Structure formats: C-alpha cells, structure tokens
C-alpha cells in the first residue's frame, strides 16, 4: 500500500466504498469488492470472519494501521468506522501493489 | 476465485511462481508478489505469518482447499508445498476477481 490515506480519499471521492462490518463481509462472502479494509483495533471476531471469507475468494485485505475510531475520522463519518469494502477505485491507486 | 487448478496451471507455465514458505513470506513482506497461495494444512505459524504480512501491504491471500501434498502434486513438484507466491500471472486469469 502507498499514501494509503489520500489513496482511501481518491476512492472515496471519485468511486465506491462500502462501510460497515457487516457489508464488507458480505462482500468477502459473496464476491463484489476489490479490497478489505479492516482498522487495526475492529474487534476480533469480525476481523477474523472477514479474513477467513477473504482467503477463500482471494480478495486482498489490507489493515488501517490506525483505531476505528481514526479510520470514521478518515472518512468523514460521524461514527467509529471498523472495515470497509472498495467496490470501484475511481480514479484511486488504493488496489495497486 | 474461479477454476483455481487451471488459473495455477496458466500462471506456473506462463507466468512466474516462486514457491515455499520463507520466499512467499518475503513477499507479503517486502512486496514483489500479486498473491499469496496458502495450503489449509500450512502450519499455523507459517500461515498466521504470511496472513499478518499480507495484511500489512494488501496483498491478497488465497487459501488453496487442499493439502501441501495435493499442492505440490498440482505444482508438479516431487515435495509438499505449504505457500507460494504469483509474481507474474502471465496469460492467467489468477488474479481475477
């Protein structure tokens, strides 16, 4: 990952992202998204139940280094965010390695 | 993922693979790589290993359904085979999603 945060911005400014634990599992469960995007401290459970759906279709996930509550910051968001699904990059460079 | 055995098949042939636990781990952590395959029977350590690297840059992990004995057996190789990486996946579809 570079300039994970502006790349986060691009994506979310100019293409389509998901939020929400539930919803991004869904999508590491049934396909639909280009990347995971899981806050250091999510808990657990649902950092596991997405990693394991994620290993079974293949679809990246990269961790926010920072807290939920940072990554909700990060995207505007009134609330704690915990993962996240980008679904189009737009114009983002978030899915190149 | 879709028709992983042939997707492997495509890119072994080609592409470019590098196969084993210490050079796939090197990858998800320094980078080089496009996807991380792990056996289900990889040791935990050498899995929990790749995972938490991959997590790191975003590189996606494909757990393969089988053994690191039916993963050697596909690779063609005269050894078990617990993780590898795609560095190239020539005219393969493995990273498709």
Do not use: W
């Amino acid at each position: 990952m570079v300039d994970f945060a502006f790349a986060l911005r691009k994506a979310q400014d100019t293409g389509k992202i998901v939020m929400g634990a539930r919803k991004s599992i869904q999508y590491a469960k049934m396909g639909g998204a280009k990347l995971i995007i899981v806050a250091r401290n999510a808990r657990p459970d649902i950092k596991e139940d997405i990693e394991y759906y994620a290993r079974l279709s293949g679809i990246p996930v990269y961790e926010f280094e920072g807290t939920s509550v940072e990554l909700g910051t990060l995207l505007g968001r009134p609330h704690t965010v915990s993962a996240l699904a980008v679904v189009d990059p737009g114009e983002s460079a978030i899915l190149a390695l």
